[PDB]
Amino acid sequence: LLTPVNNSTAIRWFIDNLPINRVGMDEFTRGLEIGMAHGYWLIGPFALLGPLRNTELGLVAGLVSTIGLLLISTIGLSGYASLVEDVPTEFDRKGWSRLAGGFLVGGVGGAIFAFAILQFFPLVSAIAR
Amino acid sequence: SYNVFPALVIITTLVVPFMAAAALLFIIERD
Amino acid sequence: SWKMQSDVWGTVDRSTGAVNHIIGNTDVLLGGQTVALSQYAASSININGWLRDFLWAQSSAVINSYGGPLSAYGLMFLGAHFIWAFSLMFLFSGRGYWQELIESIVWAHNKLKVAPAIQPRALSITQGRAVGVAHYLLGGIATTWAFFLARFLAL
Amino acid sequence: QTQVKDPLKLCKDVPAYQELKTQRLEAAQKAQADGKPVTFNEAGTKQKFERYDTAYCGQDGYPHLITSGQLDRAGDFLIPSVLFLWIAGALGWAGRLYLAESKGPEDEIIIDLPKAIKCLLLGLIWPVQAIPELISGKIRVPEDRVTISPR
Amino acid sequence: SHSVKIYDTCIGCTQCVRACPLDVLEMVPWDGNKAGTIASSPRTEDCVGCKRCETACPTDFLSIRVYLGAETTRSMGLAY
Amino acid sequence: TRFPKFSQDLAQDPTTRRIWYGIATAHDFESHDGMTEESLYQKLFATHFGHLAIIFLWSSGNLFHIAWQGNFEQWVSNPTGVVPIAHAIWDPHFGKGAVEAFTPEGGAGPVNAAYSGLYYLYYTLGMRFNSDLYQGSIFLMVLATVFLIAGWLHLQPRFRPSLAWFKNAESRLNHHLSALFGVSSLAFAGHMIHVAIPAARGQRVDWSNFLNTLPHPAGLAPFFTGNWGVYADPQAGPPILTFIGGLNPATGTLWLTDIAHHHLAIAVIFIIAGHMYRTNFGIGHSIKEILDAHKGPLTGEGHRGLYDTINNSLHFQLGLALASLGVVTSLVAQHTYALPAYFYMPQDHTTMAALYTHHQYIAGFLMVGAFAHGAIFFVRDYDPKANENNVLARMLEHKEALISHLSWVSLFLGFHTLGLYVHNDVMLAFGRPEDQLLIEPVFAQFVQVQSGKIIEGIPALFGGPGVTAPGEFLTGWLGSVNANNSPIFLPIGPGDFLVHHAIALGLHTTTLILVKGALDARGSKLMPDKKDFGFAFPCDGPGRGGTCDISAWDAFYLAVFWMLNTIGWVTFYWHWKWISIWGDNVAQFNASSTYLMGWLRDYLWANSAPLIGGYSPSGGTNALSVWAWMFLFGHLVWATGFMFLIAWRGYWQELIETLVWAHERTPLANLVRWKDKPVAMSIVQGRLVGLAHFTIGYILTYAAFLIASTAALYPNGPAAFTPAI
Amino acid sequence: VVSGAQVAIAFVVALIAGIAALLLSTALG
Amino acid sequence: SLFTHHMWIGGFLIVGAGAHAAIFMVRDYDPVTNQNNLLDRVLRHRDAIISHLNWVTLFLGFHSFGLYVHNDTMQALG
Ligand code: CLA
Ligand code: CLA
Ligand SMILES: CC1=C(/C=C/C(C)=C/C=C/C(C)=C/C=C/C=C(C)/C=C/C=C(C)/C=C/C2=C(C)CCCC2(C)C)C(C)(C)CCC1
Ligand SMILES: CC1=C(/C=C/C(C)=C/C=C/C(C)=C/C=C/C=C(C)/C=C/C=C(C)/C=C/C2=C(C)CCCC2(C)C)C(C)(C)CCC1
Ligand SMILES: CC(C)=CCC/C(C)=C/CC/C(C)=C/CC/C(C)=C/CC1=C(C)C(=O)c2ccccc2C1=O
Ligand SMILES: CC(C)=CCC/C(C)=C\CC/C(C)=C\CC/C(C)=C/CC1=C(C)C(=O)c2ccccc2C1=O
Ligand code: SF4
Ligand code: SF4
């Protein structure tokens, strides 16, 4: 069945150029961009709604929380990668494995970068004072 | 006289169950 | 039932202009600087509040109804619990058990010249489901009926 | 734990029965003059505790029945036992009589009334017929005419 | 794959063959009954185990028997 | 897909059923690929070593945590003023309200109270210091290692025993009776006399001094010369072997010197018993010879063939073992409250409730499993030729008579017992409680009077225990049966009558389901060839009227509900009768237990109040908050079981196929593919998972209710008594 | 009391039971 | 009583609407009458309808009942 949700052109261009589908990428750099995206936003719910949200170490607790979530997710993805066997290049076993490695590096890095922005956003207006 | 090792709780109840589940995944899905 | 009793229905006092609802204003500790909310707002936000403040607290009318005029509701409350539980015999089992059990019983009626010509069969698979859901619905709905009517005709 | 050496005595001696007996008679006299028609009126409640006076009561004051076969309490279980087995045996024998005289399965969903009343009347005296069929083996089918399952 | 066995009580009524939604069954010629035929189960690797054949069989106790065995993609009825 | 390696049928399944069924059939060693009889018994012997080792590691963990985190020495110094501690809590989810609610008064951190009774066991055995508990913990861990080594060693090709070794019934019986029962009981009498009785006297005897400490001052000179009464005589030193009888009125527990003499007396009986059967010394009985001689005229071939039936069927042996264990486990429950052995345990009401309820539920599972393996025996191991016309084949031959009469008794009990409760409920509703059917339990009061209970209108038939047990125990026995605050033969009335017949209903009905499942295991009229399909199979399809739940496994499944219901009735009755005793409310029990509203209001509704107030918006949390949470958790798990029990497979399989469609069509997610095709759980699996949630939810709910109601409203009591003369 | 030395001793005894359990569980499989 | 009675009557009738819609589909549906009409096109994406309804019930059940369970747990934990 062929639907307007299944068939929009700049929706097709967007999905085709997400890092999981983008032409010319290595699976590591695919995972790196995916992890950096997810780890960045994932610290938000952990830092703002977590149990230490009203203390001064709430951002640090949300950062270590996000790293914990990405590490457990990577265990599933790296385990998936060892067991697939199915298809060539991106769905290669080594292909998924490099994506799992890139995802974790990018994920933790995206959380640390989002931590640094949330911890030091007063500095962007520090020139005026 | 409150004698606990919190790191032993974290390791035995969080870490090695997730690693046993990963190990059991390799056992039941291989070949 | 709970929201109307806690937030809407009740009595007014001609002094203070005070609204006294049927249930009446839990204090939430929290600090411990107490916070006054209606009982629905303070207690219905978790299942233990529904179990303790709604089901346990308001069942005191129906379980104490014996020896007076709401005692029929106390009997219906117990009887509907029974019918509901009785339904689970039908819902949880299968007719192959019951047909084999009927076989040994038909043997004893055969042995004493009391077997009927209309051969006893277990209920069909579909009917056993229909009997189960009918008694489940009948028992569950009549329990709440006895609960509600004993609660509001006593207070 | 408190041992009860005397769990049962006559109800007329138990003071928790005298509590209840006066509390029921006062409710019956309350509804006789300026009252409502009740199940137990004043003469009905007198006879009720006339029966319970020579019964055995516990400490709560309520009558307790003795079902050991003892004959000063034969009205408690033994006399209702004979009345049950006669009436239940009558209904069982009558269905057994009606089943043997059945034309077919249509007699089981459409009750043949002059056949049913006659079997229910003949069932009323069932031990006139049952025990001469119970020692003869006429109450039972031989074993090679009754179906069984594999073993 | 399930095992579908045909026993010697078969009267050759072909009702199990018509009942089967997977064409597991067929009639071969025989001499053991008046119809001169008996059900056979050559294609039990397509058998899903639905027991519609057993439902159609009129003989006291049945002449066709399905024994549920190892499950495959075909026998589990998977379109995926 | 090589898991599971023991079943190539399962290993080639491409669905998720491969994983579930590999787990569920992993311990069914008889049905595995390539299994022989000899390799089966060799695998079992080593597996049994592993299970033994787990039991000792479990016991060493309890010993370690009580030694390291408990308050045993603080409790030994003050047994009434100190709540025993199971283990510490470290839960990072705890807020400040939960940490202080579980932290005892003056305490360092949050702890769990202990309700296993281990402190009373350790104290009565003579343990007094934490170093006693720690050396027990090390010793059981070493003992666990030895059994693990033994299991590994007896898998090596030089030490794997032959099939004839495992089937040497006579030698195993001689050794298990004489040594495993007899010598072990003799050794325990040694522990009581050398260690536990002197510790009760206040004399510390341990490994450092027990070689130079006489347990009796005349030591071992009265034993060999036959002058044995010196060990019972108070003027020849403190006695070590007595037959006082009854309970110690200072403690409310058994006499320790009676316990020592009990285990010494039964050690001699068991050591003598283990000389009965013929091993390699010419003397003794052949079991096959005893069974073959016992053939009478009414029972056909008698017991002929039963030796080879039992000795070649592990499911028969297991079913016999489970049934005997289940009877003994119930006897443990009934005799632990009636005749308690452990110091300060009858004063701990929560522990007595927990222990009775634990062992009756264990006994209920063991009883159901005994009939399950009896059913498995009939499908898998029963040979009708080798059991031709014996007592076993004759059970199957009149199985319609057995099932129809069991059906009659259960209906006979169920109609009238329910009818009497409903009669009394209607009487109470209409304001006529003197018109209740209150039947006096005079047959059971007759039993009490024969043991010397003084009940006014009930006669001692043979003349009382002065005539019938004129032993040395008689003064201490009669002083304990007729005393107040004594648990021996509790006073019973009409409420006790009605619930005992409800219990008898549950026993007969559960037996009826189990016996019909075991006797129709091989076939019925609806499925005459059922043995060709095995113990556990879903159905035989919708034909012949429909055949859901026709297997012998399904009768196990149906009877678990009835077992849970029956043990529920048993443990409800124990708990309400005892909290009415502990709470000084026996008259309320005697008045309200005769109708079912009284059970709902005065037992369930009234005792739920401290539980469901375990946490609240008004008053915060207290120590009962974990039981309050578990109580709701148990309701949730039990109700989740209903989903599996009611909504059957074909609904879920069509639902899963839409999810399979959704995954394959969703961008960024359809790149991820399952290795095993998602399918709905099988028909049998839905029943098992639904039964598991039902059962776990049943047990957790009642355990949360039983513990929290007792520990809050009736936690402690005296248990001392004044003896009766 | 259970000193820190005795906790360490108990884990060494537990480790030996662990390798014994490892020997048995692989001989069983 | 009046609120509860009419709530029960309304719920029973809506279930009967689902029953007789299904009876229509078994008994009275005809492919010749419904060729690429609204009824035919609903059947041709029934996997899309049910899987989205499966998702939204899981979303709603997690994000409504899970709040009650969150609250039960938070209150018990102090
Ligand atoms: C002719 C009537 C009749 C007779 C003589 C019997 C006799 C018996 N039944 Mg059966 N039974 C009957 C009808 C009858 N039944 C009916 C209608 C049902 C379906 C509800 C059953 C279901 C049943 C079960 C499940 C069991 C028995 C059992 C038994 C045996 C033990 C006694 C007992 O348990 O009763 C119990 C009786 C009932 C539960 C049914 C009573 C319902 C009414 C009162 C009977 C109908 C009366 C009939 C309409 C009268 C018509 C007469 C008129 C036309 C003249 C005994 C042989 C038991 C057995 O096998 O023991 C070895 C047993 O487990 N019966
Ligand atoms: C409270 C719930 C409940 C009740 C009352 C029953 C009752 C019964 N079960 Mg069931 N069972 C249940 C739940 C229940 N079960 C559940 C959840 C399961 C798991 C699926 C089972 C599984 C099960 C099995 C496997 C077996 C039973 C059997 C029985 C019968 C046992 C014998 C007896 O007690 O006779 C007395 C009868 C009763 C107590 C039933 C109630 C009778 C009512 C009160 C009389 C109605 C009179 C009324 C005026 C008529 C209605 C008219 C109205 C429409 C106007 C009895 C009919 C067994 C059996 O069939 O034995 C022969 C049997 O083998 N049950
Ligand atoms: C509105 C809109 C939109 C959007 C949406 C969204 C959803 C977004 C999101 C976004 C996001 C979500 C973002 C993120 C970002 C991120 C980042 C920016 C990151 C960074 C990182 C980093 C920088 C890191 C680094 C590191 C480290 C630190 C260490 C390690 C290594 C590494 C390198 C990794 C669209 C376009 C569709 C359309 C239009 C509209
Ligand atoms: C099915 C089956 C099975 C099973 C079975 C079972 C499970 C059983 C059970 C059974 C049981 C469960 C039984 C029990 C019984 C018991 C008894 C039999 C007891 C008795 C006792 C007595 C009688 C005592 C007496 C006395 C008294 C009471 C008091 C006084 C003293 C004296 C001691 C005298 C098997 C496996 C085999 C196989 C086949 C099939
Ligand atoms: C074990 C392992 C490797 C886990 C890996 C990690 C994973 C994926 C955990 C996930 C586990 C779960 C929750 C799997 C969903 C279970 C399912 C198909 C339930 C639907 C279903 C219901 C509700 C019934 O009532 C029912 C009744 C009778 C027969 C069949 C059924 C039936 O099918
Ligand atoms: C006017 C009047 C009321 C006259 C009395 C009328 C006369 C003469 C007899 C009365 C028979 C009647 C009314 C009922 C018996 C029905 C029966 C065989 C129940 C057993 C059974 C149970 C317990 C299940 O759970 C189950 C689950 C799933 C599928 C099948 C079954 C199943 O079959
Ligand atoms: S079980 Fe179903 S598919 Fe298999 S032969 Fe029978 S009818 Fe055909
Ligand atoms: S197996 Fe049964 S249905 Fe098939 S041809 Fe033979 S008799 Fe007919």
User: Cα(A126) to centroid of ligand 8, in Å?
Assistant: 91
Please give the structure tokens belonging to residue F500.
């005992």
Main-chain dihedrals φ then ψ at residue A10, nearest 5 degrees: -80, -5
Helix, strand or coil, per DSSP, at residue D9 = strand
Tokens representing F224 are 């060999």
Phi, psi torsion values for F267, nearest 5 degrees = -65, -40
Non-local (6+) Cβ contacts of D21 within 8 A are: D49, D52
Task: Give just the sign of the alpha carbon dihedral F683, F685, F689, F692.
Answer: positive
Distance, in Å, from the CA atom of H33 to the CA atom of F328, rounded to the nearest integer, reads 72
Q: Flag whether residue H60 sits within 8 Å of chain C, measured between CB atoms.
A: no
For strand F85-88 and strand F111-113, is the pairing parallel, antiparallel, or unpaired?
antiparallel
- C15's CB contacts (< 8 A; 6+ apart) are none
- The torsion region of residue C16 among left (phi > 0), alpha (psi -120 to 50) and beta comes to left
Q: Measured in angstroms, how far is the CA atom of residue D75 from the centroid of ligand 3?
A: 91
Residue for token pair 């989810």: F93
Cα–Cα distance between F262 and F518 in angstroms, integer?
39
Taking the centre of ligand 1 as the mean of its atom positions, its distance from the CA of residue F688, in whole angstroms, is 34
Sign of the Cα torsion F229, F235, F237, F238 reads positive
Radius of gyration of chain G (CA): 13
Nearest Cα neighbor of F565 from F638, F654, F636 is F638
Contact assessment for residue B28 and residue F674, using Cβ atoms and an 8 Å cutoff: no
Rounded to an integer, what distance in angstroms lies between the CA atom of residue A42 and that of residue A65?
9
- E19 in ligand 7 pocket by Cβ < 6 Å? yes
DSSP strands (E only) in A3-121: none
Q: Are strands C10-12 and E37-40 parallel, antiparallel or unpaired?
A: unpaired
User: Which ligand 3 atom minimizes the distance to the CA of A38?
Assistant: 12
| F175 φ, ψ (degrees, to nearest 5) | -80, -40
Taking CA atoms only, the protein residue closest to ligand 3 atom 11 is A37
What is d(CA A93, CA E5) in angstroms, rounded to the nearest whole number? Answer: 45
- For residue F458, what are its two tokens? 């009930």
Residue written as token pair 């222990």? F355
Question: F329 C-alpha vs ligand 4 centroid, how far in Å?
Answer: 13
CA distance F205 to F213: 7
Q: How far, in Å, are A68, D65, F702 from residue F633 at the CA level?
A: 27, 44, 11
- Measuring from atom 28 of ligand 4, which residue has the nearest CA? F447
User: Which residue among F97, F632, F662 sits closest to H51, beta carbon to beta carbon?
Assistant: F662
- Angle at CA of residue F541, ends F535 and F545, nearest 5°: 110
Name the pairing type of β-strands E3-6 and E26-29: unpaired
> In chain C, after which residues is the C-to-N distance over 2.5 Å, breaking the chain?
none
| Chain H closest-CA separation from residue C47 CA (Å) | 6
Check the annotation: does F358 bind a ligand.
no
Rounded Cα distance, D104 and D110, in Å: 10
The phi and psi torsions of F121 (rounded to 5 degrees) equal -65, -45
Angstrom CA distances, F636 to D91, F600, F705, H68, H76, stand at 48, 21, 15, 13, 16
A120: Cβ–Cβ under 8 A, 6 or more apart, which residues? none
Residue whose structure tokens are 């009860």: D4
For residue E36, give how far its alpha carbon lies from the nearest alpha carbon of chain F (Å): 26
Rounded distance, CA E74 to CA H34, Å?
A: 32
Q: Is F689 in the pocket of ligand 5 (CB under 6 A)?
A: no
- Quick one: DSSP state of residue E23? -
Binding site as annotated, residues of C for chlorophyll a:
89, 97
| Closest F-chain CA to A91 | F671
C112 ligand 1 Cβ < 6 A: yes
**Cα distances (Å, whole numbers) of residue D100 to C114, D94, F463, F513, F559:** 8, 10, 55, 32, 37
Residue F710 CB: number of other CB atoms within 10 A? 24
Alpha helix stretches (DSSP H) within E1-80: 15-19, 52-56
Distance between CA atoms of residues D11 and D19, nearest Å: 11
Task: Please return the burial class of C119, using the count of CB atoms within 10 Å of its CB with bins 0-12, 13-18 and 19+.
Answer: exposed
Residues contacting F378, CB < 8 A, separation 6+? F396, F518, F519, F521, F522, F531, F552
Closest residue by Cα to residue F417 from F496, F530, F518 = F496
Phi-psi region of C97 (alpha: psi -120 to 50; beta: other; left: phi over 0): alpha
Q: Inspect the interface and report whether the beta carbons of D102 and C103 lie closer than 8 Å.
A: no
D57 φ/ψ angles, rounded to the nearest 5 degrees: -115, 150
- Taking the CA atoms of residue F613, residue F617, residue F622 and residue F628 in that order, the dihedral angle to the nearest 10 degrees is 50
User: Do C and D count as touching (3 or more CB pairs closer than 8 A)?
Assistant: yes
* G10 and chain F in contact, CB less than 8 A: yes
Counting DSSP H helices and E strands in chain D, the numbers are 6, 3
- With 0-12 CB in 10 A as exposed, 13-18 as middle and 19+ as buried, what is F430? middle
Cα–Cα distance, F45 to D32 (Å, whole number): 83
Which token pair is B19? 């690693």
Smallest CA-to-CA distance from B12 within F141, F84, G11 is with: G11
Beta partners for residue C21, in sequence order:
C10
Residue B13 forms contact with F (CB below 8 Å): no
Nearest to C46 among H1, H4, H72 (CB): H72
E51, amino acid identity? K
Mutate to test the pocket of ligand 1, among C114, C118, C119 (most ligand atoms within 8 A of CB): C114
Partner chains of H (3+ C-beta pairs under 8 Å): A, C, F
Gap from CA of F426 to ligand 1 centroid (Å):
27
Does the C-beta of E51 come closer than 6 Å to ligand 7?
yes
Task: Sort out which chain F residues have CB atoms less than 8 A from A83's CB and list them.
Answer: 675
Q: Which single residue is written with the structure tokens 């030996």?
A: G16
Method by which the model was determined: cryo-EM
